[PDB]
Write a protein that binds this DNA or RNA. Structure first.
Lengths: 186, 52, 47, 52, 105, 125, 147
RNA sequence: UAAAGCUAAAUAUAUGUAGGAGACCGAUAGCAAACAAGUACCGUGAGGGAAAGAUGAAAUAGUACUCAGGAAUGAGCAAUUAAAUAGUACCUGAAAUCGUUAAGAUGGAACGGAUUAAGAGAGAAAACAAGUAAAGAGGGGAAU
RNA sequence: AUUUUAAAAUUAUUUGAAUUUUUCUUCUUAUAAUUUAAGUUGUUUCUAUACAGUACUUUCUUAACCCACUCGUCUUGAAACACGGACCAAGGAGUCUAGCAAAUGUGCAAGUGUAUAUGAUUCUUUAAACAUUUUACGCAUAAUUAAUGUAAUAUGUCUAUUGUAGAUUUGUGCCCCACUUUGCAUACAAUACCGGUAAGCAA
RNA sequence: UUACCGAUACCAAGCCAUAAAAAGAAGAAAAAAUUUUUUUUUAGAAUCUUUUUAUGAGUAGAAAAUCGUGGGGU
């Protein structure tokens, strides 16, 4: 017998393999795993890791946020492992070179009209194998509604978690425990 | 010939699928081994290392 | 990108036709399989 | 006991159905895939074959 | 474009009318392509994955020579000259496969 | 006890039998893991029906191959020997149980002229 | 789908994963929302704080059609109209678009977001936010009340 | 515009009848009932309520004849059938349980684990001999 | 099939030096080899000059040495003088629907789902497939208040709040590191602004 | 005071699996006969291949990979 943590086996956490059986995504994962192995590039390693992530961890990036993040590098290209969505709040776009998994039709048309272009990750590997002049970006991973219910339970003091309710009227979870007039608040 | 009309090229009123756009691929060209054998990434690859 | 049109008599070739752009969509065997498993469920008769 | 109110059918997204049909046409357009599916096409001239 | 050798391998590595598993002796998996010289289920040997390939196969009691659009199906010296005329180690493997097929009734 | 024939090591023979299957006819000898609460075999008491474990697994270099140092392949057709034309030295052939005498004779002929060995060569004659 | 069920993998495990001591009985805590305020009170207070009690006055019959009022913020007014016409309106300073948001399906215009500087725009709506109107006329536009 | 009245359609149909179907069940299942089934049978009564399908292609092939028996049956050198160890309980014919023969063990349990030894059954697919010459039977392919 | 290589050692020559002063002294200069390197190789027999036996492989049956309590279950604790089980066959138990959420896959994306229904030379299959003359509806896109209601920097500016860390990028000392450049996600705070409530003022 | 016997513990080696790691998307080797033949092989499946190290009890409970059955499409 030996006194070892976890009986002596190193335990990793998170994804180990691609779950999606999408042949194109599998080819892309193969290519970028090879790139990350054969080059020293943390850029390629990060892209290979992110291509594996679940849907909730490759969130969409809006055009406005893309342009805002790319504002200070007009000559480099922006690499997003999620999707690029159009933003109607943005008035004008300006010449963006962006590689991404997928582009919504409106975002694609807007980028092309602005004169930049949309790239796939195979083209990104072909033209920038080590990520020169390439800025890795990701959308808000914690902005989704599911996260609003997480953390401290709604009912703990100073908790910002939304409760699970059928509706949010005056007569749905608003009386005792949410105001001083009925027992306590929060 | 009617396939193009149905799926968006040279559309007509009662034939083309209204407001339908053909799906777009995740990859531009799936010949990943051609891109790997391209000289641009061949130059970027480090020297082959050895196993245990 | 064109395809030859053949007469019903197979020994002759008549005017060619440009291949429609729908032949360039991703092949997506997984998507086809999942959609098929969902779709083939709709013709079932109850028991 | 088996009941008639089992979920017999399924609602499939129209976009996904159209994607599947387009992909099936594209797959029928490539020679290797037809051979793999099991059609004896070793003697036809081209797999996207069209006739008058 | 839309298709590639790697993509075809992705589609056909599992679902295939030519794949024969070895259910009883668990370790064998064969691919019986018309253009598979050695019957490995491997993208470097798969007939429908390779762009160009040649092999010999007995068909209806006749050994035929097949070359891979691009499908020829011709009928030892003749085999050598056909291989040299349609050639793109593999040649020697093909020759020995033909010499083994020639002993079949 | 292990038996060693050439490069082949069979780490254990005399296949595991289900606990108490020797003295109950309704309990078949096919192995079942005793779930139990106080089950002797589950607790690994001395001298009773040891349980199978992954430690008994065979060397994977010689795992599935027969005493003739070949992997067996079961065929039901003459057309199912084409893969064996390129593997005649490390595959032996076995004819499927439900193949008639005519097809059996054809398969034996093809295997011999393919110099592939047949396991059940003299069946149904 | 029945062959992917978790109960299948406990086929020969006696208790079916429900415990050897506690067992799987029939409603051991009550039915539905039975124990609120008594023995499910911790769950109710931890996950559904304001559940018990009543607050506010009754509205005897509602008729939601009376108060139905979709809203749009000022930062989407320019995006309502197509890109080419947006370019034309921004290029030509002698004319401005007047947009009837009611036709698009909005009754009230709210004031969140930033309008383009020095780009006049006229908006027709049933209701306006104070800040929305302030921004509209700050960029040189006008708010028009319609019904 | 109450205290009078009529009115088709779109709607529903665990009933009856008649059609058509199924990723349904396949005789302990499926209706209780595949059959002479709401039958037999039970209860004073209200009611309760089963079990039970399959020889064979053809019985327009359902066992002729002989011997022995009072008979049932049995046997045959006799007989239908492709087949009677398909003989009406008849397709197949498992287990429990029992019989015959053989082999073995046997001092108040029997079985078993692990290791061998002695016997008794089976066995050649690694558990030797590729090739070479002759004659005998064959099969193919190429060559005009 | 491009580290069983390199070296290390040893042998036989050879160069110079050192030294414990030498037939295993050491250190290199070159060459050629060998293994003590760089995880077992060789010889001789036998099987056997057989085609299945008295041998070899294997199954079974018996012994023999050592060990071995009745399984399932409740239980702190079962071999229990705790309960169920005489035997065998067949049947026999986390399922279906509604609704919610999480997880993951898929499609599209500030939209998404074409509901009921319609049409169509589709009408064995087909009760499925296909389709929908340029604000139906659900959910989402905005919150807050019992509520009349009110409703998110704010026109100096197509800059898009501020810090501390932080991925990626940029150069200087195409591959190590410290300065520069940019500053994703996120975390911790700060700020504004919206709804409600206080407080001050209040035509 | 010695020697010895004595574990599923310890040590060396082999093998199975688990975990982690190093790395990876094309060319002739040998033997037997007599320059010519013969016999084997001559590999490249990324949840894959090669190699390396450590580790392995388990009720209640959880998960993965496998093995079977009726029926459907291919």
């Amino acid at each position: 017998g030996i006194a070892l943590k976890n009986v002596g086996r190193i335990k990793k956490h998170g994804r180990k393999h691609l779950v999606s059986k999408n042949p194109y995504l599998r080819l892309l994962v193969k290519l970028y795993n090879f790139l990350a192995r054969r080059t020293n590039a943390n850029f390629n390693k990060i892209i290979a890791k992110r291509l594996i992530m679940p849907k909730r961890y490759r969130p969409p990036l809006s055009l406005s946020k893309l342009q805002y993040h790319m504002a200070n590098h007009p000559n480099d290209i922006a690499v997003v492992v999620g999707s690029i969505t159009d933003d109607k709040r943005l008035f004008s776009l300006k010449q963006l070179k962006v590689c991404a998994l997928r582009f919504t039709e409106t975002a694609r048309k807007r980028i092309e009209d602005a004169g930049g272009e949309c790239l796939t990750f195979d083209q990104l590997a072909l033209k920038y194998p080590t990520g020169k002049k390439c800025v890795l970006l990701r959308g808000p991973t914690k902005a989704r509604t599911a996260e609003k219910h997480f953390g401290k339970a709604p009912g703990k003091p100073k908790s910002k978690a939304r409760p699970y309710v059928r509706s949010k009227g005056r007569k749905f979870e608003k009386a005792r425990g949410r105001r001083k007039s009925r027992a306590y608040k929060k | 010939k009617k396939l193009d009309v149905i799926y968006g090229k040279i559309h007509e009123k009662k034939v083309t699928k209204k407001n339908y756009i053909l799906p777009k691929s995740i990859v531009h060209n799936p010949d990943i081994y051609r891109i790997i054998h391209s000289d641009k990434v061949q130059a970027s690859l480090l020297a082959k290392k050895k196993p245990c | 990108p064109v395809a030859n049109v053949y007469s019903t008599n197979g020994k002759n070739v008549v005017g060619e036709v440009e291949i429609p752009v729908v032949f360039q969509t991703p092949i997506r065997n997984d998507l086809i399989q999942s959609v098929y498993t969902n779709m083939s469920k709709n013709r079932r008769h109850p028991y | 006991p088996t009941k008639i109110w089992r979920r017999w059918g399924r609602k499939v997204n129209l976009k996904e159905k159209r994607y599947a049909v387009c992909s099936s046409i594209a797959a029928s357009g490539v020679t290797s895939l037809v051979l793999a599916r099991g059609h004896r096409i070793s003697h036809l001239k081209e797999v996207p074959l069209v006739v008058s | 474009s839309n298709v590639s050798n790697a993509l075809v391998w992705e589609l056909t590595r599992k679902s295939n009318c030519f794949i024969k598993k070895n259910k009883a002796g668990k370790k064998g998996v064969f691919l019986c392509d018309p253009l598979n010289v050695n019957y490995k289920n491997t993208p470097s040997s798969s007939g429908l994955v390779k762009s160009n390939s040649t092999n010999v196969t007995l068909k209806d009691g006749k050994v035929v020579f097949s070359v891979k659009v691009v499908n020829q199906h011709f009928k030892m010296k003749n085999v050598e000259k056909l291989l040299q005329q349609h050639g793109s180690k593999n040649k020697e493997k093909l020759l020995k496969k033909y010499k083994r097929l020639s002993k079949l009734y | 006890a292990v038996k060693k024939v050439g490069k082949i090591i069979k780490k254990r023979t005399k296949k595991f039998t289900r606990f108490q299957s020797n003295r109950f006819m309704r309990v078949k000898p096919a192995w079942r893991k005793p779930r139990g609460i106080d089950c002797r075999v589950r607790r690994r008491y001395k001298g009773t029906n040891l349980m199978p474990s992954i430690g008994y697994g065979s060397n994977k270099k010689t795992k599935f191959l027969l005493p003739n140092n070949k992997y067996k392949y079961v065929v039901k057709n003459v057309k199912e020997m084409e893969p064996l034309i390129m593997n005649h030295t490390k595959y032996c052939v076995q004819i499927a149980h439900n193949v008639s005498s005519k097809k059996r004779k054809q398969i034996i002929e093809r295997a011999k002229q393919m110099n592939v060995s047949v396991i059940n060569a003299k069946a149904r004659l | 789908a029945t062959r992917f069920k978790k109960n299948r993998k406990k086929r020969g495990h006696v208790s079916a994963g429900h415990g050897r001591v506690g067992k799987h009985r029939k409603h051991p805590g009550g039915r539905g929302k039975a124990g609120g305020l008594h023995h499910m009170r911790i769950n109710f207070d931890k996950y559904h704080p304001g559940y018990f009690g009543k607050v506010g006055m009754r509205h005897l019959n509602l008729l939601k059609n009376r108060t139905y009022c979709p809203t749009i913020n000022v930062d989407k007014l320019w995006g309502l109209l197509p890109e080419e016409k947006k370019k034309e309106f921004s290029e030509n300073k002698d004319i401005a678009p007047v947009i009837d948001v009611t036709r698009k399906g909005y009754f009230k215009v709210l004031g969140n977001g930033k309008l383009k500087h020095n780009q006049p725009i006229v908006v027709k709506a049933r209701y306006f936010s104070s800040v929305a109107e302030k921004k509209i006329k700050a960029v040189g536009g006008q708010c028009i009340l319609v019904a």
